[PDB]
């Protein structure tokens, strides 16, 4: 019958690894690099679009950085279509929580929820896992500014600075070298762009190959603002930091 | 399981609930505690149809205790009240609704403020300085409207509460067998054992 | 791959035959039926000295008149025990009486072949079900993952089973006392066990009409072990 | 019907009448309104006999399964709650049940009132049935915690007699039970007809009735 | 739950020494309107059974189709379908009784009263009643509706108990049945003159008589009846 | 018994010259008993304003529902919902409960951010849209409000003149209704400024 | 629905999926449990391959199931969350239906049952997780420590370790832990738990987590400095 | 509106002796004022030395008896031909009845036989399955006419020993099977006189260790 | 070979190997004999023990007062199929007040087994059955194979070494069919038939199992000292 054609997506290897999770991680290692850096006064999200064209409409384009709500955003590395399925589910969870408790969802609770959905696809159902790794940048009034990552296994961890996608080994070493705890957003912006500029597989880092975002309490008084950078604004910050 | 009162003073919320339970023409109990602790700084009193009251209250308690363990964090009184309201709004369009009215008295440790929420069985929520359910308000609100200040001490709140109970005991036809009084403040929940 | 409910060319179910191999790796369990009662004994086999051995529960009560010992993948036995306890108590609810040992055993064995593509595989554990009822007296049954159950005068299951069964072949007779059966289980357990038998790595139990199912204290078993040592040194 | 149960120093007394009626017709003179759930737990029975019998006989199943799983005897609080939750499943459906779950566990003697509404009340004294008001009068005026087993047994017996006399739908005979930590002890069946005359003479009560 | 629309009135029957007789009129009433005059309410099953049905006609036609299907089904993979494994009156009744009680238990009854008349393999007479409630009973005489009130008293004068059955011939039994049908025509406002009659005998088999009429009626005495009390002319 | 008059309350909306106004009372009651004098019935999602009268639990539920839906709309569309679009969403959402409806009388008010055109709309409890040019009324004193608005209203009123008209329409209507009053709020809405005013009124 | 039998017997009577799940546990960071006379201590390894980690928000290795019971694990991190959630739900469900909190043994039996179920249900794979469950029964001062594994078997331990290099730390515990006289105080119990991890851990910095559970719902997690003082005192005695 | 219930009349009587039991019932079946049958058996031998009658609505009565007979058959299949004891049968019938708690079998059920000590046994059920072991029970139409007579003549209620004047009760001496049958016949003869639904015939099933025996007696047919 | 992985696959020669393997399980089973006359039908079964401490596995199962069978192969499959027969016999009695014809019982067993041979996921039954009964057309004997094939016979045998008993019955055909109104002689012929299949072991008191049904004889099973008369 049908058994013949079953790849069995949810089995251990003899070494105790999940084949499909490992292979999904291999896929993600070829995706454009995304970086997150947490500072005392905000969070930075920086990401590289994959080998683009001059005819691509950049100002209406979005493949890396997505808004989950007013307080939480994600950077994507992997299959964009897979990511959008999960992103829409996360957006719904955030609104479910807000409707139930009349408070914005804490960052970790949203992260745990999405990570549990990823986990399920590795243990039951016989379906392929989502080929996506997320960097979560968010704020709530319990822990303040937070960075998380999740991968196809459904495992998630918290970070001061982190990269996903291509060249994460090189990127993480560079971040580990220059990162300090008393760092500010403007410094973190520079670190993120400098790290991408050194790890990129492209010849040079330009505005049309980047997506950029910040989460700042640089919003008038005790509140948080999300800023998805426009193409011209990415071009300006590249000149300011002295990369172009 | 008819009379439940609430008053929010300067630094605490006070809930007063009757002790009587009646089955038919006989009073079965005169020491019944119509309340459940949802979290260390959140107390809920209840009144409505027999059975439904305790079942609903304990169901809410279990859910808040579950949340507390999962997140290692106490939900704000506002968050708890919204959860409770949704459950009742859900319930009113069910096959057999839970005929339960509640008062939620909590102390918000973040804002350092006492808070009193009144929610009826339809899911009608209001935040009030003082509240009641059923006909209880008909006898007591004129006294509360007159004497209440937002800067009252806990002791003054208890005295105003005594006056409300005395008026109930005078003009209500039913013997509700006195009230159990509990105080919710920054230090948690405690019962006034002489009232 | 191949179906879970597939027959071999010899006319046997592969999965059932393979589960029997898992039971062969299990710790030894022995049962002896007498006219004074049925004795059940097990090898605990703790994997480390830091493991508190009294938490090893391989002998289990099903009802007051029915006990049970297990060998193999012992985790699989929990749902079987739960079903057995439910079946015993449910029959009492429906009929205001004790359930027959055979009927209880048959109810457990009905679960066995409920696997396919129901549970995904057979059970990897064998059970010795011992009990008493008014119709057939003291009884001992061997419940397998094949769904088959045999009644036995005496039976051993687990890793030392064929050596123990040969020993039970010679020792059992229809006039055994309860005390004689107890010492006989201890003797054969001591023979097949890797480690030296004592009250902490071996457990005894019995079922009598008067007192029902009882698991023996470590102090009670220790005395029976000392009684065994002396009578073997007596000749 | 008249059933009562009360806590006291050396345990809990359970006393019930024995009458069943179909309108004015007395269908039974001797129904058993105490169910021996197990050797440590008793349940009274008012409302629908079938509902009481079926659901408390089933409660015994659950309490036995509890002991087999956990190795300990179930508490009076837990047992009473299992019963109250079965009721809430058939809430609104017409079940009719009012009983006192009586037992002795770790916290000492225990007594819970459970009805078809799901109500579950812990207490020292309870009475249900068409003659409960009469029994309460005798109970409230004579009840002490300091009662002896002998006097407590008589109190529960006398309280049912009071109800049997005045309530038309209570009578027949009185069944007594005493619940200890070692289990319940049955204290016999007592015909109300014979008991009334006996109590009238010895006690001097019921002067208005000619004997 | 429904209400009967098109309806059939009494079915009457009795046992005699060598078999059973059953009869029913050919009317299908629509309330007080005598709407349909050619309705057959006796339905034979094989050569040993006749099922007589009163009440709702749409449900009768449904039952008629069930019985037709029953004969078809019995013949499947059955070499002895016309011999030892043929349908018995008792099999047919028990099936109908099962259906009737099941339908009332779902609160959706077949709104009928049914009498199954026949002769068993061993020659024994079979006569049993079942209705919309699933109620069943047997008696030497059986009748439905008005027949129960008017026919049974007349038929019971012939066979009053079990011991009267061997003393009752087919001629005496048929005579009693025919007279009862006349009495019902005099007194039941939902009856007709035309009726069917079936005899199931252990020797002569099934005799089915159609287009029978009520005859030998007394009406002449009506000419002398004038007014309602005092009127003379 | 009647779910649409247990709690009481009113909402009124009006159009003016390059502006709209929406107003409501502050009462929540249990039939004769006044329970709250701070129960606001007007909400906003971006620049679109929604007033809701009727059963208070449904007022709260629907506000939470439309906040939920307009937040998802914004995340996907990358823009704030407009009054015309939101009106259709309210209608659709109410009709999906055709045979178990929310017992409410919603009122939409706002200015389209692209055209600058003032917009108001009203609904019955199951979704039927009333898109009036002049004014919309709702609640337990809707008859009274119709009477006030029909005489007091004139087209193309300036924002500060519209304030006086809608305020007097609400106040005097509420003072002829037992189940309305206990305070009042008025929103004056222009293309990029909104002013909120609490009115002084009798408290019986 | 997906019904495929993934956990099946092999000719030699082994269920490879269950055995491969144990290999996932072998890969996981080391976890250790030691019960004293009046306490239980849970120690956990943190691999220092991950720095730039935010330790405030990163999922901690020890999880409270109720106010009186904790759970630590070795193996797949994502898998452990599902078992923890189920356990927490069951704990509240028990309090609601039986009006007592769960015993440690009962909670263990439940988690172990969930693990067993996932070894003979269609369309699912076993949990790649072994757990250590510790605490005190309500109104009881006797320490409790249990272990579960993917197959679903469970048992009580005086002291136990799971995860990578657990063979080594078990070796240490077997020669250092005396049953006749268990660590009499909190200090002695924590010291022995830190000592056991120092056989395997690497640096005694942020690589060792310690959680102490005492009777009557008294649960606290030690900080870096508090643990660092144990690490310091151990090696200064070792220099001799 | 469709009424799923009806009343077929009938009266039944169960009496437990020292080493025997009788279950008796009239053979008349009725609706309203009409007689359906003068002889429609109502008391049935169900096997295992148990006799049963489910009186009231005959359709429900026949259904319950049929299902209990079936339960005896399957008890033999499932439990190695073990004899179903009267107490075990009683508990089983409770579950059959309570299974339709919200749409009950509209019948009053009585079973009779011998207990496991060989002593006479009678069990009595209400429509929803509450039951109990009893010495004496009449059921159905004329139950209220029969029970007071049995209280007086079987249990000797209100009868005292002459000369003592109320001080000493009449002692409860055991009754033979011949004595019980006399009281059964007189109970039904008296019921037939005063109750319109009682008549035609009386069928008695007698249970002893030797088995089940039947006796039939004519009753007045008016 | 490549076509025996499941029941849903024909081989190139049109064979169903899983069904054939299920048939093999019957051949491994202990011998059982069936035979009938015009008044009675008899089952004789050689029971098998695990060892000397164990009981002898029961082979004969009662389905109704007028019908029952004996098994050879997987015993749990016989329990499933006999439970189905018990239900079908019972459905016929309750609904139609009719004892289920033995021939119809065979048709029902055929169809139930067939469904397990044409669908994916399932397996064939691993047991053979000999059904005896007395109905309105007299005594009957049926042989059931888990392929679905059911056959009405005067006599037969299934299990290990069943060929010896089958040849004996083929010789004795004209004799045992005429044994009318004599239950003991018909059983003797069955005990003599099953004896042709024995090697090394002989018929003992706890080894032998016999069943009989007939004109005025309900289906009854004889075990223990009740069969010593025939040894
Ligand atoms: Mg006023
Ligand atoms: Mg009469």
């Amino acid at each position: 019958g049908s058994r013949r054609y079953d790849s069995r997506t949810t089995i251990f290897s003899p070494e105790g690894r999940l084949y499909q999770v490992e292979y999904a991680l291999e896929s993600i290692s070829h995706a454009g690099t995304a970086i997150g850096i947490m500072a005392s006064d905000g969070i930075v999200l920086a990401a590289e679009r994959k080998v683009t064209s001059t005819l691509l409409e950049q100002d209406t384009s979005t493949e890396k950085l997505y808004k989950l709500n007013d307080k939480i955003a994600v950077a994507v590395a992997g299959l964009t279509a897979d990511a959008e399925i999960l992103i829409n589910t996360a957006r719904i969870h955030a609104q479910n929580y807000l409707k139930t408790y009349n408070e914005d969802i804490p960052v970790e609770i949203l992260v745990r929820r999405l990570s549990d959905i990823k986990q399920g696809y590795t243990q039951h159902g016989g379906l392929r896992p989502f080929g996506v790794s997320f960097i979560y940048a968010g704020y709530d009034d319990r822990y303040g500014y937070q960075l998380y990552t999740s991968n196809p296994s459904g495992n998630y961890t918290g970070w001061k600075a982190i990269s996903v996608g291509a060249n994460t080994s090189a990127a993480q070493t560079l971040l580990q070298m220059d990162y300090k705890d008393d760092m500010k957003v403007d410094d973190a912006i520079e670190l993120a762009l400098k790290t991408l500029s050194k790890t990129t597989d492209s010849s040079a880092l330009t505005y049309d190959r980047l997506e950029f975002a910040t989460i700042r309490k640089g919003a008038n008084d005790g509140e948080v603002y999300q800023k998805i950078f426009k193409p011209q604004e990415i071009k300006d910050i590249l000149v300011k930091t002295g990369i172009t | 399981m008819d009379i439940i009162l609430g008053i929010r003073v300067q630094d605490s919320v006070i809930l007063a609930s009757s002790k009587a339970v009646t089955r038919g023409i006989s009073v079965l109990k005169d020491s019944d505690d119509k309340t459940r602790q949802l979290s260390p700084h959140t107390l809920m009193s209840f009144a409505g149809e027999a059975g439904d009251t305790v079942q609903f209250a304990e169901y809410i308690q279990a859910n808040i205790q579950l949340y507390s363990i999962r997140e290692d964090y106490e939900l704000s009184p506002q968050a708890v009240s919204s959860f409770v309201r949704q459950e009742l709004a859900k319930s009113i369009r069910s096959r057999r609704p839970y005929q339960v009215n509640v008062l939620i008295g909590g102390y918000d440790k973040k804002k350092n403020k006492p808070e009193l929420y009144q929610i009826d069985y339809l899911g009608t929520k209001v935040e009030l300085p003082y509240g009641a359910h059923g006909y209880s308000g008909f006898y007591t609100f004129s006294l509360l409207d007159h004497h209440y200040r937002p800067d009252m001490t806990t002791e003054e709140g208890l005295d105003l509460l005594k006056l409300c109970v005395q008026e109930l005991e005078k003009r209500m036809p039913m013997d509700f067998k006195g009230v159990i009084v509990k105080i919710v403040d920054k230090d948690g929940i405690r019962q006034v054992d002489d009232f | 791959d191949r179906g879970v409910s597939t027959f071999s060319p010899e006319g046997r179910l592969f999965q059932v035959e393979y589960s029997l191999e898992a039971i062969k790796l299990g710790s030894t369990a022995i049962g002896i039926a007498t006219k004074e009662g049925v004795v059940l004994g097990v090898e605990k086999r703790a994997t480390s000295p830091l493991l508190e051995s009294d938490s090893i529960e391989k002998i289990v009560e099903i009802d007051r008149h029915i006990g049970c010992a297990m060998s193999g993948l012992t985790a699989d036995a929990r749902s079987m025990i739960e079903h057995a306890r439910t079946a015993a108590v449910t029959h009492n609810l429906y009929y205001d009486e004790d359930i027959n040992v055979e009927s209880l055993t048959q109810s457990v064995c009905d679960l066995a072949l409920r696997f396919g593509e129901l549970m995904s595989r057979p059970f990897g554990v064998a059970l010795l079900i011992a009990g008493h009822d008014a119709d057939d007296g003291y009884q001992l049954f061997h419940a397998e993952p094949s769904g088959t159950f045999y009644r036995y005068n005496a039976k051993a299951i687990g890793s030392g089973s064929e050596g123990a069964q040969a020993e039970l072949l010679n020792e059992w007779h229809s006039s055994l006392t309860l005390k004689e059966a107890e010492l006989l289980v201890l003797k054969i357990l001591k023979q097949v066990m890797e480690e030296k038998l004592d009250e902490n790595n071996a457990q005894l139990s019995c079922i009598t009409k008067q007192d029902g199912f009882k698991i023996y204290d470590n102090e009670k078993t220790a005395e029976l072990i000392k009684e065994l040592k002396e009578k073997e040194a007596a000749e | 019907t008249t059933t009562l149960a009360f806590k006291f120093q050396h345990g809990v007394i359970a006393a019930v009448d024995s009458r069943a009626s179909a309108g004015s017709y007395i269908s039974a003179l001797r129904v058993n309104k105490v169910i021996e759930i197990n050797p440590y737990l008793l349940g009274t029975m008012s409302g629908c006999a079938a509902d009481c019998q079926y659901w408390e006989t089933l409660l015994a199943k659950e309490c036995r399964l509890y002991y087999l799983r956990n190795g300990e005897r179930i508490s009076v609080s837990a047992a009473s709650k299992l019963l109250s939750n079965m009721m809430c499943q058939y809430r609104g459906m017409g079940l009719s049940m009012g009983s006192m779950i009586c037992g002795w566990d770790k916290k000492g003697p225990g007594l819970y009132y459970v009805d078809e509404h799901g109500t579950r009340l812990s207490g020292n004294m309870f009475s249900t049935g068409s003659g409960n008001t009469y029994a309460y009068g005798v109970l409230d005026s004579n009840y002490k915690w300091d009662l002896s087993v002998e006097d407590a047994l008589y109190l529960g017996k006398r309280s049912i007699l009071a109800a049997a006399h005045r309530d038309a739908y209570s009578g027949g005979s009185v069944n007594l039970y005493h619940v200890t930590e070692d289990g319940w002890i049955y204290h016999g069946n007592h015909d109300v007809g014979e008991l009334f005359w006996k109590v009238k003479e010895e006690e001097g009560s019921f002067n208005n009735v000619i004997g | 739950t429904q209400q009967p629309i098109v309806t059939g009135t009494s079915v009457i029957s009795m046992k005699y020494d060598n078999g059973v007789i059953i009869a029913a009129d050919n009317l299908g009433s629509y309330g007080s309107l005598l709407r349909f005059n050619g309705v057959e309410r006796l339905i034979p099953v094989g050569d040993n059974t006749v099922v007589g049905i009163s009440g709702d006609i749409s449900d009768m036609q449904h039952i008629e189709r069930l019985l037709k299907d029953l004969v078809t089904e019995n013949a499947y993979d059955n070499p002895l379908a016309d011999a030892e494994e043929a349908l018995e009156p008792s099999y047919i009744f028990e099936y109908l009784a099962t259906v009737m009680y099941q339908r009332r238990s779902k609160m959706n009854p077949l709104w009928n009263a049914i009498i199954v008349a026949g002769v068993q393999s061993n020659g024994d007479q079979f006569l049993r009643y079942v209705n919309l409630l699933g109620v069943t009973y047997s008696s030497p005489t059986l009748a439905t509706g008005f027949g129960a009130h008017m026919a049974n008293p007349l038929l019971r004068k012939v066979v009053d108990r079990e011991s009267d059955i061997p003393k009752t011939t087919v001629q005496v039994a048929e005579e009693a049945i025919v007279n009862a049908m006349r009495v019902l025509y005099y007194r039941d406002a939902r009856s007709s003159r035309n009726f069917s009659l079936a005899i199931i005998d252990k020797n002569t088999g099934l005799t089915f008589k159609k287009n029978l009429q009520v005859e030998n009626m007394k009406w002449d005495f009506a000419k002398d009846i004038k007014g309602y009390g005092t009127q003379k002319i | 018994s009647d779910p649409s008059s247990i709690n009481g309350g009113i909402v009124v909306a009006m159009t003016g010259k390059d502006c709209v106004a929406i107003a409501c009372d502050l009462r929540l009651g249990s039939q004769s008993l006044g329970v709250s004098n701070k129960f606001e019935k007007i909400f906003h999602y971006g620049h679109v304003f929604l007033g809701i009268t009727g059963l208070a639990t449904d007022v709260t539920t629907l506000n939470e529902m439309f906040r939920y839906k307009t937040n998802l709309y914004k995340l996907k569309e990358e823009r704030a919902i407009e009054p015309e679009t939101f009106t259709q969403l309210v209608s659709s959402s109410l009709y999906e409960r055709r045979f178990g409806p929310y017992f409410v009388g919603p009122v939409v008010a706002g200015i389209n951010s692209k055209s600058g055109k003032p917009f108001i709309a009203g609904f019955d409890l199951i979704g039927c849209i009333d898109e009036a040019k002049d004014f919309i009324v709702s609640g337990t004193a809707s008859d009274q409000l119709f009477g006030m608005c029909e005489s007091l209203y004139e087209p193309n009123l300036e924002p500060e003149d519209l304030f006086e008209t809608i305020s007097q329409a609400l106040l005097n209507a509420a003072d002829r209704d037992a189940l309305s009053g206990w305070g009042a709020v008025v929103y004056i809405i222009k293309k990029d400024e909104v002013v909120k005013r609490y009115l002084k009124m009798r408290q019986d | 629905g997906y019904d495929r039998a993934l956990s099946i017997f092999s000719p030699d009577g082994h269920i490879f999926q269950v055995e491969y799940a144990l290999e996932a546990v072998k890969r996981g960071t080391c976890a250790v449990g030691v019960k004293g006379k009046n306490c239980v201590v849970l120690g956990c390894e943190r691999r220092s391959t991950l720095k730039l980690q935010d330790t405030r928000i990163t999922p901690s290795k020890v999880s409270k199931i109720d106010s009186h019971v904790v759970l630590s694990f070795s193996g797949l991190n994502a898998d452990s969350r599902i078992l923890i959630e189920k356990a927490r739900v069951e704990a509240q469900s028990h309090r609601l239906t039986l009006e007592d909190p769960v015993t440690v043994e009962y909670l263990t039996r439940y988690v172990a049952g969930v693990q067993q179920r996932y070894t003979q249900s269609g369309g699912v794979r076993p949990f790649g997780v072994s757990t250590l469950i510790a605490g005190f029964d309500p109104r009881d001062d006797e320490p409790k420590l249990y272990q579960t594994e993917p197959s679903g078997i469970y048992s009580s331990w005086s002291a136990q370790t799971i995860g990578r290099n657990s063979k080594t730390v078990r070796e240490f515990l077997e020669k250092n832990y005396d049953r006749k006289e268990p660590p009499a105080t909190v200090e002695e119990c924590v010291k022995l738990t830190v000592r056991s991890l120092l056989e395997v851990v690497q640096t005694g910095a942020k690589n060792i987590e310690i959680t102490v559970v005492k009777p009557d719902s008294d649960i606290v997690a030690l900080s870096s400095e508090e643990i660092n003082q144990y690490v310091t005192q151990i090696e200064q005695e070792k220099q001799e | 509106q469709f009424n799923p219930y009806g009343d077929n009349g009938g009266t039944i009587l169960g009496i437990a002796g020292e080493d025997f039991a009788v279950l008796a019932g009239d053979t008349r079946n009725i609706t309203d004022y009409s007689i359906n049958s003068r002889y429609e058996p109502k008391v049935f031998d169900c096997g295992d030395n148990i006799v049963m009658s489910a009186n009231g609505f005959a359709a429900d009565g026949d259904a319950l008896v049929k299902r209990f007979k079936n339960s005896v058959k399957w008890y033999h299949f499932d439990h190695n031909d073990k004899k179903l004891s009267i107490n075990s049968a009683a508990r089983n019938i409770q579950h059959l009845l309570y299974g339709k708690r919200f749409f009950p079998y509209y019948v009053h059920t009585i079973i009779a036989g011998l207990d496991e000590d060989g002593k006479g046994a009678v069990y009595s059920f209400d429509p929803v399955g509450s039951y109990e072991r009893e010495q004496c029970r009449a059921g159905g139409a004329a139950a209220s006419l029969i029970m007071p007579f049995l209280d007086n003549q079987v249990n000797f209620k209100n009868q005292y020993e002459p000369g003592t004047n109320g001080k000493v009760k009449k002692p409860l001496k055991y009754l033979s099977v011949e004595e019980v049958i006399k009281l059964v016949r007189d109970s039904f003869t008296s019921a037939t006189e005063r109750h319109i639904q009682v008549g035609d015939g009386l069928e008695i099933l007698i249970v002893t260790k030797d088995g089940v025996r039947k006796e039939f007696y004519e009753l007045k047919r008016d | 070979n490549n076509y025996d992985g499941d029941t849903v696959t024909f081989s190139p020669t049109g064979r169903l190997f899983q069904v054939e393997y299920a048939l093999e399980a019957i051949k491994q089973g202990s011998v059982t004999v069936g035979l009938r006359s015009n008044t009675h039908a008899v089952l004789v079964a050689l029971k098998r023990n695990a060892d000397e401490l164990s009981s002898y596995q029961k082979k004969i199962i009662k389905c109704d007062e007028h019908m029952g069978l004996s098994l050879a192969g997987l015993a749990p499959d016989a329990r499933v199929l006999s439970n189905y027969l018990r239900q079908q016999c019972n459905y016929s009695s309750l609904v139609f007040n009719r004892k289920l014809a033995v021939e119809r019982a065979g048709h029902l067993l055929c169809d139930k087994a067939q469904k397990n041979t044409q669908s994916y996921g399932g397996r064939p039954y691993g047991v053979g059955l000999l059904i005896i009964g007395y109905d309105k057309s007299g005594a009957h004997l049926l042989e059931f194979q888990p392929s679905g094939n059911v056959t009405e016979l005067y006599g037969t045998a299934i299990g290990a070494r069943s060929q010896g008993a089958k040849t004996y019955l083929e010789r004795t055909l004209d004799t045992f069919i005429k044994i009318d109104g004599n239950p003991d002689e018909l059983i003797k012929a069955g005990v003599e038939a099953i004896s042709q299949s024995l090697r090394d072991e002989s018929l003992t008191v706890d080894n032998l199992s016999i069943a009989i049904v007939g004109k005025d004889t309900p289906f009854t099973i004889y075990d223990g000292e009740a069969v010593a008369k025939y040894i």
Side-chain angles (χ1 to χ4, degrees), chain H residues 14-18 20-22 113 120-122 133-136 154 180:
Chain H
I15 299 170
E18 208 270 294
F20 65 91
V22 302
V122 167
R133 188 172 180 175
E134 287 172 343
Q135 211 171 71
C136 207
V154 180
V180 169

Side-chain angles (χ1 to χ4, degrees), chain B residues 23-115:
Chain B
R23 250 35 159 196
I25 79 165
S26 301
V27 179
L28 294 195
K29 208 177 177 181
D30 54 30
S31 63
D32 182 54
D33 190 5
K34 297 158 187 51
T35 213
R36 293 299 149 116
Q37 177 174 125
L38 308 183
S39 66
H41 303 94
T42 310
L43 186 68
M44 190 173 75
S45 67
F46 45 83
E49 201 198 335
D52 299 73
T53 50
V54 173
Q55 290 158 48
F56 178 79
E58 288 181 358
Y59 167 78
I60 295 301
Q61 185 178 49
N63 276 99
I64 304 304
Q65 286 177 3
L66 178 56
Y67 190 102
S68 292
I69 288 292
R70 191 190 291 113
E71 311 301 336
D72 191 38
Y73 196 79
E74 186 174 16
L75 279 166
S76 68
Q78 194 289 129
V80 173
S81 70
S82 295
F83 174 77
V84 170
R85 194 204 81 81
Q86 186 178 60
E87 290 298 304
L88 289 164
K90 198 191 237 133
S91 178
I92 196 58
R93 285 164 197 279
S94 296
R95 193 174 111 194
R96 192 169 172 80
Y98 268 74
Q99 229 102 114
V100 189
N101 303 303
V102 298
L103 296 173
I104 295 166
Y107 189 90
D108 193 323
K109 295 284 282 185
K110 174 175 263 72
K111 303 211 297 287
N112 289 300
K113 273 168 149 62
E115 287 183 358

Side-chain angles (χ1 to χ4, degrees), chain A residues 5-18:
Chain A
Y5 313 98
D6 184 8
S7 298
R8 301 149 74 206
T9 60
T10 64
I11 57 162
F12 286 107
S13 66
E15 292 76 43
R17 295 183 197 274
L18 301 170

